[PDB]
Write a protein that binds this ligand. Structure first.
Ligand SMILES: *[C@@H]1O[C@H](CO)[C@@H](O[C@@H]2O[C@H](CO)[C@@H](O)[C@H](O)[C@H]2NC(C)=O)[C@H](O)[C@H]1NC(C)=O
Ligand SMILES: CCCCCCCCCCC[C@@H](O)CC(=O)O
Ligand SMILES: *[C@@H]1O[C@H](CO)[C@@H](O)[C@H](O)[C@H]1NC(C)=O
Ligand SMILES: [Ca+2]
Ligand SMILES: [Ca+2]
Ligand SMILES: [Ca+2]
Lengths: 407, 78
């Protein structure tokens, strides 16, 4: 059935008007993109420019609409006319989507009834948790961390951007298949607000080759260059003028082995008989390793993997320096891994606390929000236009429209 | 493929549940079913004839035909 189509194309299954925004949380629904405030109208969706300033209805789902009874001005004109709204879009991989298997599942120690309360949600989100991710999370982090996602920082900044997030990330995404993800991106070049796009394929280009020679399976600089260029041409024909595109470099995954190779996996904390070295070897034996290159005990193979990853980052940096586009400007950011570690030690944490316990590979919720924190502060200093201005009408919008309909 | 990983993972929480609850595999296997919001059509029944009596997860999943062997993949030290 066409259910298969929605998941292969990473679009919601529950979406009557087929505008890619849902009233259903999971199955690529509003956990991934702003909730559709009218799933019966294809011309009502987050990110849209207001039709007649939403004097009669809320057409861009930011909760602002109607008219001020005093002067007959539409509220969205009084509160958003010059604030330069913009959306946040993530074109990412498993880390961008916040892949996460809760330790509470595999730990017999606490296997309470409350420990499996979140399972059908996780499974319907492909074990991803975009609603808690660093770029597009909107639910409160129940993790004792008061950092905010990039989207919530954009909303807090300008309450007109309410609900204008899109997490277009797929677990196995890379430069090799990003063309499919861009088809599922929603933006009308002439009818919607501009957007910030973060391209964050932080490892899959070097983390395939499960049944082959790992190095021979990795993306070459030439391949990635052509893939990303075609990627950017596509974006240029979808993104309203005045958008912004950030290319994120690849991760420094040598960190994984060094940090965990002799730490106890949660399935071995009780009996003390399992380490990540064992986990890495077990999954490598089964040819199901999420990253053979970096999860190896063979430190030459790990060195070749980091070298390729660094070579691919410099390719992305070269593209951001020498290519221009009419509808967006283009930037490059390094993987702020080192800066994330310094900031995390100050908070009394240790490095191994920044990696998913179960898979020992993806950054966890804590690290992602720290990566968002570093990106937000760095974009401010260098490229202030990318994030826009603070909107003086946040309290007033707050007083007229409350939660602005929620999420 | 993942059936070996999943089996080893499933079988490893069952066996780590009997060790935690000082019970048999039949007791843990049934108990596990109580945690998922009704697998007892298989486990209270289908797993009884198959499970408790024979007794780690690598052996079971290798014994249960879930980890085909044609390198011997094992999560726990042999
Ligand atoms: C979504 O918009 C549609 C109209 O585009 C709304 O449905 C119609 O609303 C008119 C009045 O505006 C009624 O006379 C019709 O009977 C409604 N139904 C149809 C099929 O046209 C609908 O109410 C809006 N949804 C929400 C949640 O506000
Ligand atoms: C022992 C825990 C179970 C091990 C299975 C972990 C599987 C990790 C899947 C990550 C998927 C993406 O990152 C890569 C592609 O797709
Ligand atoms: C390390 O990995 C490389 C693959 O790039 C392989 O050629 C080499 O033989 C490996 N060495 C050891 C000791 O496993
Ligand atoms: Ca709609
Ligand atoms: Ca819709
Ligand atoms: Ca509006």
């Amino acid at each position: 059935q066409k259910i298969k189509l929605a998941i292969k194309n990473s679009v919601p299954i529950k979406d009557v008007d087929s505008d890619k925004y849902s009233i259903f949380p999971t199955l690529r629904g509003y956990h991934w993109r702003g909730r559709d405030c009218n799933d019966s109208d294809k011309t009502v969706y987050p990110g849209r420019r207001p039709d007649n300033w939403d004097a009669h209805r809320d057409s861009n789902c930011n909760g602002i609409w109607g008219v001020d009874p005093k002067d007959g001005i539409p509220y969205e004109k009084k509160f958003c006319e010059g604030s330069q709204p913009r959306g946040i879009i993530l074109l990412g991989d498993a880390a961008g989507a916040h892949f996460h298997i809760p330790p509470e599942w595999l730990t017999v120690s606490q296997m309470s009834v409350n420990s499996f309360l979140n399972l059908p949600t996780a499974v319907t989100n492909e074990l991803d948790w975009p609603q808690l991710s660093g770029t597009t999370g909107f639910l409160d982090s129940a993790s004792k961390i008061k950092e905010n996602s990039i989207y919530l920082r954009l909303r807090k900044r300008n309450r007109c951007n309410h609900r204008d997030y899109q997490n277009i990330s797929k677990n196995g995404a890379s430069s090799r298949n990003v063309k499919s993800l861009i088809e599922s991106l929603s933006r009308n070049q002439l009818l919607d607000h501009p957007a910030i796009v973060i391209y964050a394929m932080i490892g899959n280009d070097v983390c395939n080759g499960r049944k082959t020679d790992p190095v021979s399976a990795m993306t070459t600089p030439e391949q990635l260059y052509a893939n990303v260029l075609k990627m950017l041409e596509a974006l240029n024909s979808h993104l309203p003028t005045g958008s912004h595109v950030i290319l994120y470099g690849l991760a420094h995954g040598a960190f994984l082995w060094d940090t965990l190779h002799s730490r106890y996996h949660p399935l071995g904390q009780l009996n003390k008989d399992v380490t990540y070295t064992q986990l890495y070897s077990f999954l490598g034996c089964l040819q199901v390793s999420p990253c053979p290159g970096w999860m190896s005990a063979n430190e030459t193979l790990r060195a070749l993997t980091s070298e390729r990853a660094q070579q691919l980052s410099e390719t992305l940096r070269k593209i951001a320096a020498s290519k221009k586009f009419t509808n967006f400007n283009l930037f490059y950011l390094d993987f702020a891994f080192q800066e994330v570690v310094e900031e995390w030690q100050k908070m009394g944490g240790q490095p191994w606390e920044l990696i998913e316990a179960v898979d020992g590979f993806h950054p966890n919720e804590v690290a992602l929000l720290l990566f968002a924190d570093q990106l937000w502060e760095k974009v401010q200093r260098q490229w202030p236009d990318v994030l826009g201005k603070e909107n003086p009408f946040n309290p007033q919008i707050e007083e007229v429209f409350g939660d602005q309909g929620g999420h | 493929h993942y059936t070996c990983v999943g089996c080893v993972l499933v079988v490893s929480v069952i066996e780590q549940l009997a060790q935690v609850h000082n019970s048999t595999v039949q007791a843990s296997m049934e108990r596990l079913c109580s945690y998922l919001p009704a697998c007892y059509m298989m486990v209270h029944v289908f797993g009884a004839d198959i499970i408790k009596l024979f007794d780690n997860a690598d052996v079971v999943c290798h014994t249960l035909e879930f980890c085909k062997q044609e390198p011997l993949c094992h999560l726990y030290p042999l």
